[PDB]
Amino acid sequence: SHMASLKDLEGKWRLMESHGFEEYMKELGVGLALRKMAAMAKPDCIITCDGNNITVKTESTVKTTVFSCNLGEKFEETTADGRKTETVCTFQDGALVQHQQWDGKESTITRKLKDGKMIVECVMNNATCTRVYEKV
């Protein structure tokens, strides 16, 4: 037996390692010059959790992006790379699943605790960005 809750994601996370970020952004339609520079950005991720209410804050020291939703409700997101998406967050199988849709396409961000590190997987089509965060 084991248990994972939404609440266990709540907190301040620092990027420790990243793989596939650029190939992922090549999928989302980001330009060659734009994605090579973004791969160097190491933003913190601050998550807060109330009921089925979550806030997900990307904090780079210079720019703040923030989203807020009730799980299960579709809402308008404007993303760091500038997509106008329709997102739905849900929590199942121990993972916050963030489902993005825009212009007939789709992308999934999954955040899940493993050994106390937050593992974040961003999938679009064939491309995968796996990243590891440490509590701060």
Please tell me about this protein's structure.
One of its GO terms (molecular function) is long-chain fatty acid transmembrane transporter activity. This is Fatty acid binding protein 5, epidermal. One of its GO terms (cellular component) is cytoplasm. With 136 residues, the chain is mostly beta strands. It has a single domain, classed as Beta Barrel (Lipocalin), CATH 2.40.128.20. 10% of the residues lie in helices and 57% in strands. It is built from two helices and ten strands; from the N terminus they run βααβββββββββ. A ten-stranded antiparallel beta sheet has the order 4-3-2-1-10-9-8-7-6-5. Strand 2 and strand 3 form a beta hairpin. Helix 1 runs antiparallel to helix 2.
CATH architecture descriptor: Beta Barrel
**Shape call:** globular
Strand numbers in spatial order across the main sheet = 4-3-2-1-10-9-8-7-6-5
* Helix run count: 2
The ordered H/E elements are EHHEEEEEEEEE
CATH-assigned fold name: Lipocalin
Task: Tell me the number of structural domains.
Answer: 1
Indicate the radius of gyration in whole angstroms: 14 Å
Determine the strand fraction and express it as a percent band: over 45%
Main pleated sheet: 10 strands, antiparallel
Beginning-to-end CA distance, first to last residue: 28 Å
- CATH level-four homologous superfamily name: Calycin beta-barrel core domain
PDB class: lipid binding protein
Keywords: lipid binding protein, lipid carrier protein, endocannabinoid, beta-barrel, beta-clamshell, domain swapping
Assembly: monomeric
Entry title: Murine epidermal fatty acid-binding protein (FABP5), apo form, poly- his tag-mediated crystal packing
